[PDB]
């Protein structure tokens, strides 16, 4: 186990947070080139 | 036809009733994009009346163009600046309908008279977007705009 | 001959009926949602 | 020899290349992969992979997370959800973000939110300590 | 001639990618810029009942529109700009209009002066 | 028919032909972009599959759960993309249910949900919309993987069905298996893998799931855009081939009308 | 007048969603029910009372569940039943001209009874 | 045209042969939706005959209505019930075609007389769905539906 | 229409001036593909002339077809043979243009009168590939092919 998994997270969420951090920590130039191809648009429907 | 074609030149104002609109149930069937007039000028009827009339015509024409695309794509694919255009155009089509006092035998409703100010204000508001939250059927066969609001409320309540 | 705007509805063929039906479907759905929202707003506004 | 495959979802860096040694971070802890390393699976920590080509040159890429597989046939697959060369980063931003995250660390809204703050903190920590 | 020669080509190019106008996005910057110039050019040609314009004023408006001093403007406002810019030029720079009318040509001196006028006005709009 | 009828029909068909021509242009643009973006995603996904490829993990055949993730988009007009994917989904679901396995279905895209909402209506576990409007990203795959893991369904095996993009003309409805850490752990082929406790293994399984979902999204998006290009090209060609005959008929009818009116006039003139 | 007021409107709505939700699905079902009710034989006209009886049965919703291909026969059977059991009701509707509230209740009873025992 | 338009009112049963069908190779080219008779009465030809004939006409008419879309958006844009209807309609269009005795020299196929009961039975089966697995061509230019099944078997090998 | 229908029974050839080729700067605008002729028969004009004309038509049709693919799938995905045919087709297009002694005031170029045999020779050479090693503009508005070669030299000196 790891400390983040203690809250019940999954490695997917861990990678999401880490990648979000690195994205936030980019040059002003590369933000415009990395902000796209990063977000998500999918959305769920109740079953 | 030669007969109506020749008569068109002898009138100061024509209101071309249309069968296609009457099939949609809009009554009177007057065709907004074919009825013309000679006093429809910013000098004779006023700036705001003219701007609203031209806005109604332009939005209806845009809707006519969009229907061709809706033929193939479907309407889910339309952008979000056009779904608004289609919705507004349908609302305006419905709002142009009205119940007459001599048609109580057919429709059963009560005939109404809508003074000029009510019509101009209602169409201004429909164009501006002040009624995107009401269903289009709220405008069907009503007089002034406030009656459309009341009818929408009654539909919601009885829902 | 040339092409006008909104001639698919005028022709009245299968494509025109398909127009009118699909558009009625979509706006029936949206009207149901708007009526629901109107009722819910009414309840949230009696307070 | 080693067949190295380093890839991000968006771009690709090495593709069945032939590198000598590659140093990768990990949850169980840093390690270096050589031409016949014993097979393993691991998931990365936010660190900086270093690759040494057949000739002696070092390429450093900061990776945020992902996985690394070393197989029986000496074929390394290093997949990173976000890989960037060190020149694509700015200290000031990262340091400010680290300080901000620590500032929110006091506000332990909940075990979950605490976890997210901690992950941000360590990610930015490795960011700065590789950049500085 | 100097101005409409290129306006004709710009509109000709616009007319052959007019269909996309609805889709608008999903297309390269080439056709996007084509049909962003075409829309502005079209909205310059709108005019009102019984208000013809002197040739020099038409030339000035089409010059502003086609040389490119309008592609950074929302189409709906174009007309206003016109109805403003026109008046502005009529008030202050009557000498330039007189020179265009008499010479019947846009001399490079007049061309430069007109570019300056358009840039200055478009800046403060 | 009367001249007016043919005129109206011809005008409508001209409109449709123009619309489909522009549609083919747009779909070509989107497909070029997607096929450009699918280069890195192809090697990325192939790398992700590497492990289960070169250390084969067959599942113990005495399980009870499964999962079938079909991948498609919301939009139609794209040939038999959604048709083929849903056909494969239902084929596999019925074959599995023959053995009594309790299957569940996740559809990525509204079309897949709809095509299978008559039969397999209950088996749905979750579905997603807004696919294909914009190019998919790893964010989308991570969202799907999360909404899968969180749902209280501990599947023991799984398959993902999508449309591998062979070429701008052809695509193949492929299926890729996906396992669960319970199966991964108890596979003899895994004995040769060191530093594998039952924790890195299933962090790795979560990541592998996200990877395969992202790969399938990219493949299916490229395939769908190529299919829409082809379908709209065929529709435009059909519309033009129809306008040929309609124009010939229109010219014949126009001449017939002129002749008929003229004959009526001269027959009246002669009669008096 | 009473029955046609609703029936014409329901058909008018169904006619614009014919080329195909829950509410609209119910609308299409009802429209198809009415349309199958408007079919007729040949050289077999019906009294106005029977026409209004069957139209009422179909438009109040007492056929929203029966299968489409069965309405064609249901109607027929239903008519016989009334013409053989409740001719007094039909005579009352015909003479009175209008459908009275007691007559409406009698029709409601008869329609539900025949529906239950028809399957 | 005035001549046929006028003669239509003097005939009990008409049989409109159409070039559009003949260009498809179907023969006799009879147009099912223009042919009429005055003895198409359930009290004259019975109820099974009348019902089968009307079901055939209904399905052919539905397919004709679909043809406008099919000719552009292809059959890949139809609901599943519509695809099934189109399949049945094509099967029926083909099954209506028959080889005549006097057309042996043209076609070479042996001429067939199909008794009325066999015709009703075959069309009833095609409408029920007993032959949704065979291909269209299994029905092209055959007598009773037994020959259709036999030809489908021959094609399957 | 009866007027053109009656006229075309007498036309022995057709020349289709098209705007779409005046825009491209090629003059005369004669459309190489719409233009036809009755005497494009090996018996009448000869075997070599017929074969050259057929080759030019075939390559121009191929380039017309490939223009759409270049406009859609991009140029980078064309085989070597496809790119070679595109180069040949562009060179042939430019070679069809000629300077007219009466349009000197427009082009300024001195007018040329290309005799038949020189035209056949030039197009034979261009098609066979002898001039794959010259730039497109070396062919725009030149008379014989040898003049095109001279232009190619003088544009790199």
PDB file of C-alpha atoms in Angstrom, chain G residues 48-117:
ATOM      1  CA  UNK G  48     -72.903   7.346 -35.075  1.00  0.00           C
ATOM      2  CA  UNK G  49     -73.351   5.864 -31.603  1.00  0.00           C
ATOM      3  CA  UNK G  50     -71.010   2.963 -32.357  1.00  0.00           C
ATOM      4  CA  UNK G  51     -68.466   5.293 -33.956  1.00  0.00           C
ATOM      5  CA  UNK G  52     -68.377   7.489 -30.863  1.00  0.00           C
ATOM      6  CA  UNK G  53     -68.262   4.438 -28.592  1.00  0.00           C
ATOM      7  CA  UNK G  54     -65.170   2.975 -30.256  1.00  0.00           C
ATOM      8  CA  UNK G  55     -63.487   6.362 -30.656  1.00  0.00           C
ATOM      9  CA  UNK G  56     -64.017   7.026 -26.945  1.00  0.00           C
ATOM     10  CA  UNK G  57     -62.662   3.590 -26.077  1.00  0.00           C
ATOM     11  CA  UNK G  58     -59.548   4.268 -28.123  1.00  0.00           C
ATOM     12  CA  UNK G  59     -58.946   7.881 -27.152  1.00  0.00           C
ATOM     13  CA  UNK G  60     -59.376   7.666 -23.383  1.00  0.00           C
ATOM     14  CA  UNK G  61     -56.520   5.160 -23.338  1.00  0.00           C
ATOM     15  CA  UNK G  62     -58.330   1.855 -22.945  1.00  0.00           C
ATOM     16  CA  UNK G  63     -56.189   0.479 -25.777  1.00  0.00           C
ATOM     17  CA  UNK G  64     -52.756   1.867 -24.860  1.00  0.00           C
ATOM     18  CA  UNK G  65     -51.584  -1.681 -24.062  1.00  0.00           C
ATOM     19  CA  UNK G  66     -53.385  -3.928 -26.552  1.00  0.00           C
ATOM     20  CA  UNK G  67     -51.307  -4.956 -29.544  1.00  0.00           C
ATOM     21  CA  UNK G  68     -51.693  -2.979 -32.791  1.00  0.00           C
ATOM     22  CA  UNK G  69     -52.576  -5.926 -35.024  1.00  0.00           C
ATOM     23  CA  UNK G  70     -55.314  -6.822 -32.522  1.00  0.00           C
ATOM     24  CA  UNK G  71     -57.172  -3.504 -32.471  1.00  0.00           C
ATOM     25  CA  UNK G  72     -58.477  -4.277 -35.955  1.00  0.00           C
ATOM     26  CA  UNK G  73     -60.270  -7.253 -34.435  1.00  0.00           C
ATOM     27  CA  UNK G  74     -60.873  -5.809 -30.967  1.00  0.00           C
ATOM     28  CA  UNK G  75     -63.002  -3.003 -32.384  1.00  0.00           C
ATOM     29  CA  UNK G  76     -65.054  -5.522 -34.328  1.00  0.00           C
ATOM     30  CA  UNK G  77     -65.574  -7.793 -31.340  1.00  0.00           C
ATOM     31  CA  UNK G  78     -66.153  -4.827 -29.050  1.00  0.00           C
ATOM     32  CA  UNK G  79     -68.893  -3.487 -31.299  1.00  0.00           C
ATOM     33  CA  UNK G  80     -70.732  -6.801 -31.333  1.00  0.00           C
ATOM     34  CA  UNK G  81     -70.560  -6.946 -27.552  1.00  0.00           C
ATOM     35  CA  UNK G  82     -72.210  -3.566 -27.122  1.00  0.00           C
ATOM     36  CA  UNK G  83     -74.719  -4.169 -29.896  1.00  0.00           C
ATOM     37  CA  UNK G  84     -75.590  -7.399 -28.080  1.00  0.00           C
ATOM     38  CA  UNK G  85     -75.444  -6.256 -24.442  1.00  0.00           C
ATOM     39  CA  UNK G  86     -75.740  -2.490 -23.925  1.00  0.00           C
ATOM     40  CA  UNK G  87     -78.001  -1.255 -26.697  1.00  0.00           C
ATOM     41  CA  UNK G  88     -79.774   0.883 -24.100  1.00  0.00           C
ATOM     42  CA  UNK G  89     -76.615   2.951 -23.655  1.00  0.00           C
ATOM     43  CA  UNK G  90     -76.253   3.468 -27.406  1.00  0.00           C
ATOM     44  CA  UNK G  91     -79.896   4.460 -27.717  1.00  0.00           C
ATOM     45  CA  UNK G  92     -79.465   6.932 -24.877  1.00  0.00           C
ATOM     46  CA  UNK G  93     -76.362   8.475 -26.464  1.00  0.00           C
ATOM     47  CA  UNK G  94     -78.063   8.697 -29.847  1.00  0.00           C
ATOM     48  CA  UNK G  95     -81.327  10.229 -28.630  1.00  0.00           C
ATOM     49  CA  UNK G  96     -79.676  12.582 -26.141  1.00  0.00           C
ATOM     50  CA  UNK G  97     -77.204  13.535 -28.876  1.00  0.00           C
ATOM     51  CA  UNK G  98     -74.514  14.223 -26.288  1.00  0.00           C
ATOM     52  CA  UNK G  99     -72.607  11.892 -23.980  1.00  0.00           C
ATOM     53  CA  UNK G 100     -73.984  12.446 -20.487  1.00  0.00           C
ATOM     54  CA  UNK G 101     -71.924  11.893 -17.354  1.00  0.00           C
ATOM     55  CA  UNK G 102     -73.899   8.796 -16.391  1.00  0.00           C
ATOM     56  CA  UNK G 103     -73.555   7.652 -19.993  1.00  0.00           C
ATOM     57  CA  UNK G 104     -69.833   8.378 -19.806  1.00  0.00           C
ATOM     58  CA  UNK G 105     -69.547   6.257 -16.664  1.00  0.00           C
ATOM     59  CA  UNK G 106     -71.530   3.437 -18.274  1.00  0.00           C
ATOM     60  CA  UNK G 107     -69.184   3.544 -21.259  1.00  0.00           C
ATOM     61  CA  UNK G 108     -66.166   3.530 -18.947  1.00  0.00           C
ATOM     62  CA  UNK G 109     -67.476   0.451 -17.161  1.00  0.00           C
ATOM     63  CA  UNK G 110     -68.291  -1.337 -20.407  1.00  0.00           C
ATOM     64  CA  UNK G 111     -64.936  -0.571 -22.011  1.00  0.00           C
ATOM     65  CA  UNK G 112     -62.928  -1.713 -19.001  1.00  0.00           C
ATOM     66  CA  UNK G 113     -65.029  -4.859 -18.619  1.00  0.00           C
ATOM     67  CA  UNK G 114     -64.656  -5.891 -22.252  1.00  0.00           C
ATOM     68  CA  UNK G 115     -60.949  -5.027 -22.182  1.00  0.00           C
ATOM     69  CA  UNK G 116     -60.317  -7.225 -19.152  1.00  0.00           C
ATOM     70  CA  UNK G 117     -62.200 -10.180 -20.628  1.00  0.00           C
TER      71      UNK G 117
END
